[PDB]
Scaffold this motif. Structure first.
Motif: not given
Lengths: 116, 116, 116, 116
Positions: A111-113, C8, C10-15, C101, C103-104, D10-11, D103-105
């Motif tokens: 998901a991208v929000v 992207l 994947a922690v924040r769901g953002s670019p 995508l 993630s840490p 994944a975090v 992952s969270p998102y």
């Protein structure tokens, strides 16, 4: 365009075209009410499902008919569908992109929000 | 056993068997020096690459020969290979499992790092 | 725009914004020649790396500086970078989207290849 | 053991421990009937859900309570849960491992299906 759905095929590295998508919203009685539906375009995207004003806070479910996609390619896949369930707009209006990546025995969703 | 690689095939829904795996350490002059190799077992796993005493802090590369894997299955692949590169042991010795998921046009990799 | 890169978080769901990207091409002597570089925009995308005419057949490597991205967020991630290596244009010109995508302790990459 | 679930984070780069997992069979009237449950172990695994004789052909749902997992870690999640739904045993009994990456998102899921 507060909600869009994008579907990709990880076997071919392509958009997954003509994939059926049904969206539901959880009502105050806990049942799942039909909310919108459509099919992915030539770019694998499905736009125009809702509007800012209709897309209120709530729990939404996006059901992707991945099995029919694979079966049309001759493949008997693992999953019956891909379902993505999430709370939307709980801290004000946002734009949601639900991406799904398909393989016969795997899917991924992200998901991208964004806040417009 | 400080370093394990595990590979899955998202097309077949199976372990990825007989995948060649090469491991390198980064040398003083920035070049990649060969360190271990093997191929995945019938469970998709490759164990036995190194020992606790040899696996000292440094930067390591794992390169998974995905192209040859897909070619052996008759499936057209995108990538030449899948590589992780990581600094090991920077806060003490750890056990590392590199978990890899393969599709022809997509892969993923994830480290599962546990304290001995 | 025969090559674009999208990243992207994947922690924040953002670019993933301001991520450094370096592209290399393998020369006839087998060394990796710098080919293009840039950083992701506010949308997580990096456009304008090459042109149809300069992007000939060859083996390309896209190196994503994921470690600096995480370190600026206070996180010490697993990977030093994400590298995506692939043969391009081997059966004529194509448009490539390399998505990553983050993630840490994990990354995923997908290629979308279209024929304009 | 015909059905195993395995979950990774994944975090943290770890097994996802203490994740609640519920399993359902689809009933004659299309409703989801509860079938098994458990929580993942310190290795991120949940075994023992069913037996070969009870796990007959049918459509099954596995629903992974990802939201509660991320909340317990203090990390904001996107999804309410992660679900696979699949038809089991359609060409004979199989062993199924449902491999989930969180992952969270974003999440992924993959079936590893082996013949007994």
């Amino acid at each position: 365009c507060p909600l869009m759905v994008k579907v990709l095929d990880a076997v071919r590295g392509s958009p997954a075209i003509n994939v059926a998508v049904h969206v539901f919203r959880k009502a105050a009685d806990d049942t799942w009410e039909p909310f919108a539906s459509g099919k992915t375009s030539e770019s694998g995207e499905l736009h125009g499902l809702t509007t800012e004003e209709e897309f209120v806070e709530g729990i939404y479910k996006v059901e992707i008919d991945t099995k029919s996609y694979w079966k049309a390619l001759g493949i008997s896949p693992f999953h019956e569908h891909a379902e993505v369930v999430f709370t939307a707009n709980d801290s004000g209006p946002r734009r949601y992109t639900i991406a799904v990546l398909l393989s016969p025995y795997s899917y991924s969703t992200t998901a991208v929000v964004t806040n417009p």
